[PDB]
Write a protein that binds this ligand. Structure first.
Ligand SMILES: OC[C@H]1O[C@H](O[C@H]2[C@H](O)[C@@H](O)[C@@H](O)O[C@@H]2CO)[C@H](O)[C@@H](O)[C@@H]1O
Ligand SMILES: OC[C@H]1O[C@H](O[C@H]2[C@H](O)[C@@H](O)[C@@H](O)O[C@@H]2CO)[C@H](O)[C@@H](O)[C@@H]1O
Ligand SMILES: OC[C@H]1O[C@H](O[C@H]2[C@H](O)[C@@H](O)[C@@H](O)O[C@@H]2CO)[C@H](O)[C@@H](O)[C@@H]1O
Ligand SMILES: [Ca+2]
Ligand SMILES: [Ca+2]
Length: 686
């Protein structure tokens, strides 16, 4: 199947995701609606259930609403069984309408539907070429109070109906009992509860195994991706061992939520997207887009800088999920604002690098503040708004113009208010012009592009006041005026003759798993795939077409590899880097080192004999280790994904900048569990 097929669960770059709060979309089955105090059919009270469900979604897929818009993926609320209690929070009643308060990860939330409703949803969507993504929130269960076990459901956790345990009398230690976070440090927001949510202890084997099993069921149900909640609040090593369980079983595209504030740029965020096995919601992009197009607190120069920086900070920039708003921000559209701002931010997002996501109702110009105000019910299913038409014209280009799905981004003209950028991939080009100045036109002279000589009509047809472009030889465009609030998209598509890889997925897996290599120019005859210097050809290449190749990872040593392909004639493609071959299946193990005293600005790291521990390379050592919460300095700890059942030799080190101090003595040693978790406690050797 081609790269753009609904069947590609490994690549969402050619899709347009539509984000839905199931409860607030469409109630197609009134019979599963909660009753009494939990329910408000008028949806005036935004904290109760309004009744939207899977049937409703199914209906909107079949009556042409989503498909007419060009949407090709839907992202829905966590589908698992939620607590049934109404929670009064100081006078205000709250329900689990959001799906974020899990009680059993093996069953469905009956307000959304039954397992059968779930399967029908997957079927309908699939039939209309729409992929299905689900929220998955394994960080916690529900609101709990340790000494008031009668509060809510005491954070109770069931395994398909069977009680595993609760927050009060947690002898099994299913949960963390370290207090609540102040979001002060990263370590602090990981090992303590968020608010009053009962925090799962992933270092407990039962929880570990339970969650890895629960996700397999959903995979088995046909899901196409997973959106992980609170990824900055769970151990990084555990999360990696979870991605491995997914990828070594049934790989799907996974992206998590790691919130970034205005002007916030975090190296821990980049390292996580670069190394964990999953990608992230692009908050850096969204916050910037809002400053520029909404709040006017930055200009084009700041947008451009975000585009260049990000392309450099993220190893796979094309996998970061972009948006202009979501359930955690006030709606982009402010009641009294010019609609053009939203139209422009949308056009920008759709033609930009990454995987775009549209929060439901955006195309209807919904306004609203923070939670729960940004979660009202979609007021209408009209296809006549300008925003709806913007999406409708632009979304499809991601499927038909690879420059949009996979190209580089390049600024070709800029000032405070105007940005002209070009996307390029193979013999494919897209040039987009944006003038945020809603009051003044701009004189554009000196624009140089890669488009071939000719005239080009605005892809939006003048919808946002775009114009035609005339490019002469050299790619130089002739002078033109870019209207106030103007937005124009111009493009050129052609066959790519040489193999060009545009995307690889999953990005991490053990030998033997099949990965998907997407791009153009691969030809229709099997060629060769190189993992590093190792050549793979023949039968292990399970499928080969011009835009997509499926091949099993060879049994090479764990480590990081570059991928390159060569057509049947031997022409090789560009190198796609950062592909991680696992040493085997993974388990999450906690390493604890006692009495490793350090100087300021000096931290302890861990290294060892397997690629998962960096193979003795201090530049690739794991850390810095933690030393506040679970163990206190001069004791350090850390949860690490390691190959299961392997005997591993390791050592700790102290780094300062790139200056390294090794532990003395001989290597510590240990044998990883075959499943479940473990804790290895040792003392630092001088
Ligand atoms: O002409 C090549 C040139 O085009 C763009 O420069 C623009 C500039 O962004 C505008 O602010 C204005 O000064 O006109 C210039 C073109 O004459 C590109 O930004 C630039 O990199 C490139 O050299
Ligand atoms: O919170 C981690 C913190 O630990 C390390 O600093 C040690 C310091 O080296 C000791 O001399 C001592 O005073 O305790 C500190 C930990 O509280 C790193 O130096 C530091 O960068 C790191 O954040
Ligand atoms: O280079 C691989 C090598 O790294 C580690 O050796 C350390 C050693 O433990 C230190 O005491 C120190 O002198 O630096 C060496 C780095 O070369 C591993 O301990 C060793 O097994 C491994 O082969
Ligand atoms: Ca319903
Ligand atoms: Ca946590």
């Amino acid at each position: 199947a081609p790269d753009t097929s609904v069947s590609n669960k490994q690549n969402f770059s050619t899709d347009v995701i539509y984000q839905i709060f199931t409860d607030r979309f469409s109630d197609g089955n009134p019979a599963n609606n909660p009753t009494g105090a939990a329910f408000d059919g008028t949806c005036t009270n935004l904290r109760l259930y309004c009744g939207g469900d899977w049937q409703g979604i199914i209906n909107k897929i079949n009556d042409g609403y989503l498909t007419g818009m060009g949407v090709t993926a839907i992202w829905i609320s966590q589908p698992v069984e939620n607590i049934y209690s109404i929670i009064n929070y100081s006078g205000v009643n709250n329900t689990a309408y959001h799906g974020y308060w899990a009680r059993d990860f093996k069953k469905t939330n009956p307000a959304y539907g039954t397992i059968a409703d779930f399967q029908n949803l997957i079927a309908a969507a699939h039939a209309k070429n729409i992929k299905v993504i689900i929220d998955f929130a394994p960080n916690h269960t529900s609101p709990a109070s340790s000494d008031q076990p009668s509060f809510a459901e005491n954070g109770r956790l069931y395994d398909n109906g069977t009680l595993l345990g609760g927050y009060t009398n947690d002898t099994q230690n299913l949960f963390h009992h370290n207090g609540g976070t102040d979001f002060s440090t990263t370590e602090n927001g990981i090992y303590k509860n968020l608010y009053d949510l009962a925090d799962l202890n992933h270092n407990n084997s039962t929880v570990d195994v339970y969650l890895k099993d629960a996700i397999k069921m959903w995979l088995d149900l046909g899901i196409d991706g997973i959106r992980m909640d609170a990824v900055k609040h769970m151990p990084f090593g555990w999360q990696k061992s979870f991605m491995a369980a997914v990828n070594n079983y049934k790989p799907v595209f996974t992206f998590g939520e790691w919130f970034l504030g205005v002007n916030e740029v975090s190296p821990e965020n980049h390292k996580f997207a670069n190394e964990s096995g999953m990608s992230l919601l692009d908050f850096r992009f969204a916050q910037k887009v809002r400053q520029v197009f909404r709040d006017n607190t930055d200009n084009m120069y700041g947008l451009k800088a975000m585009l260049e920086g990000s392309a450099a900070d993220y190893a796979q920039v094309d996998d970061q999920v972009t948006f202009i708003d979501n359930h955690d921000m006030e709606r982009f559209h402010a009641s009294n604002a010019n609609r053009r701002k939203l139209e422009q931010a949308l056009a920008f997002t759709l033609t930009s690098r990454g995987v775009p996501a549209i929060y439901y109702g955006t195309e209807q110009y919904m306004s609203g503040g923070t939670d729960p105000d940004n979660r009202a019910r979609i007021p209408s299913f009209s296809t006549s708004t300008t925003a709806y038409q913007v999406i409708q014209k632009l979304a499809p280009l991601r499927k038909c113009n690879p420059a949009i799905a996979y190209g580089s981004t390049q600024e070709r003209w800029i000032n405070n208010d105007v940005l002209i950028y070009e996307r390029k991939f193979g013999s494919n080009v897209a040039v987009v012009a944006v003038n945020r100045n809603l009051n003044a036109p701009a004189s554009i002279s000196g624009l140089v592009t890669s488009l071939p000589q000719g005239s080009y009509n605005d892809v939006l047809g003048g919808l946002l006041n775009g114009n035609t472009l005339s490019v002469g030889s050299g790619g130089a465009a002739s002078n033109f005026t870019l209207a106030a609030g103007g937005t124009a998209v111009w493009q050129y598509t052609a066959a790519t003759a040489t193999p060009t890889i545009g995307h690889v997925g999953p990005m991490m897996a053990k030998p033997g798993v099949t990965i998907t290599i997407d791009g153009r120019g691969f030809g229709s005859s099997k060629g060769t795939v190189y993992f590093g210097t190792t050549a793979v050809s023949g039968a292990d290449i399970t499928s080969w077409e011009d835009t997509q190749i499926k091949v099993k990872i060879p049994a090479v040593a764990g480590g990081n590899y570059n991928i390159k392909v060569a057509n049947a004639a031997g022409t090789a493609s560009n190198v796609y880097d950062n592909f991680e071959v696992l040493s085997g299946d993974q388990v999450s193990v906690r390493f604890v080192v006692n009495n490793a005293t350090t100087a300021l600005g000096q931290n302890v790291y861990l290294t060892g004999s397997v690629s998962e521990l960096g193979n003795w390379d201090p530049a690739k050592a794991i850390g810095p280790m933690y030393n506040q919460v679970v163990y206190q300095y001069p004791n350090w700890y850390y949860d690490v994904s390691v190959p299961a059942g392997k005997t591993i030799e390791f050592k700790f080190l102290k780094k300062q900048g790139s200056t390294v101090t090794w532990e003395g003595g001989s290597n510590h040693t240990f044998t990883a569990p075959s499943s479940g978790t473990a804790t290895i406690n040792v003392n630092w050797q001088p």
